[PDB]
């Protein structure tokens, strides 16, 4: 009740922190949704976080080159997409690992097991395995798109 029908408030109750509590920044839905993504989900080991993020990213990264790459109008369309996505995930893993190497040179913190050298390295390992796996399974599903189509239509029974 009262007089505050207002939907925007000071972020975390401190009006002098440069941020605002808004329906996009700090609603219950965004808190629960962002807070349960692999990056923030409570209790997860960084290996599983990396694995999940890599699965999602490797899976979806096959598409752009698959439909729009230079081999899209060749007999090696899906292989071209796969090669592109694999090389991209390799470069991304190198970027993640270089980041971990440079930002965790000093004393290791304690609150965030992902924000350590060991944790960020585990995240990179999981991300590599998940990205390569997701890219290869997206490629495998696309390369056998006819059997997936017949499966979804019942063309085999």
């Amino acid at each position: 009740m009262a007089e505050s029908n207002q939907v925007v408030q000071a972020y975390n109750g401190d009006p002098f922190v440069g941020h605002l509590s808004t329906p996009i920044s700090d609603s219950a839905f965004t808190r629960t949704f962002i807070g349960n993504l692999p990056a923030y989900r409570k209790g997860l080991s960084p290996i599983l976080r990396g694995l999940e993020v890599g699965m999602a990213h490797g899976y979806f990264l096959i598409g752009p080159w698959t439909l729009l790459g230079p081999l899209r109008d060749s007999e090696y369309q899906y292989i071209g997409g796969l090669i592109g996505a694999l090389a991209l995930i390799l470069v991304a893993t190198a970027a993640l690992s270089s980041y971990g190497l440079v930002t965790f040179q000093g004393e290791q913190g304690s609150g965030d097991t992902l924000q350590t050298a060991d944790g960020w390295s585990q995240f990179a390992a999981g991300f590599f395995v998940g990205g390569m796996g997701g890219a290869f399974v997206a490629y495998f599903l696309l390369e056998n798109l006819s059997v997936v189509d017949g499966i979804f239509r019942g063309l085999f029974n």
């Binding site: 979804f152 239509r153 019942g154 063309l155």
Partner: protein
Amino acid sequence: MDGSYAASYLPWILIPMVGWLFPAVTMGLLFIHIESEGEG
């Protein structure tokens, strides 16, 4: 299984989405919710 109606590629992916993904996700959310032991 086919369809001559408009945009007949929609059941193709919506039937798996309604039968597999929607129930899996909603049951998983409700499962983690009813088991949540946060005080209150």
